[PDB]
């Protein structure tokens, strides 16, 4: 009975997820300047990054 209670306890403390993330060798960054900005300013920011 104690083992059953502990199993119940552990099931309610274990965090939940869907699928683990794995190193695919790629990742993506997104740049968003304040609204009304121009292409040249975005290009400058992209050059900095």
């Amino acid at each position: 009975v104690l083992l059953l209670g502990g199993m119940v306890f552990l099931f309610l403390r274990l965090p939940t997820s869907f699928l683990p993330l794995e190193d695919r060798g790629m990742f993506t960054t997104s740049v968003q300047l304040p609204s009304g900005s121009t292409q040249q300013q975005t290009l400058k920011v992209v050059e900095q990054i």
């Binding site: 009304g36 900005s37 121009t38 292409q39 040249q40």
Partner: protein, 49 residues
């Protein structure tokens, strides 16, 4: 004639998309890029009169 009324209603009641301020390509130091709109559809019967 009826054609005159129809043509006037067509011309004076429409949505016009002008374009963009600072659209691409733009000058070296363009400040902003904003969408430009023009006259919109009439709403009230008084506007049509």
């Amino acid at each position: 004639t009826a054609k005159d009324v129809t043509d006037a209603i067509e011309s004076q009641n429409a949505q016009i998309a002008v374009g963009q301020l600072g659209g691409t390509p733009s000058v070296d130091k363009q400040a902003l890029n904003a969408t430009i709109n023009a006259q919109s559809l009439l709403q009230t019967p008084e506007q049509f009169r």
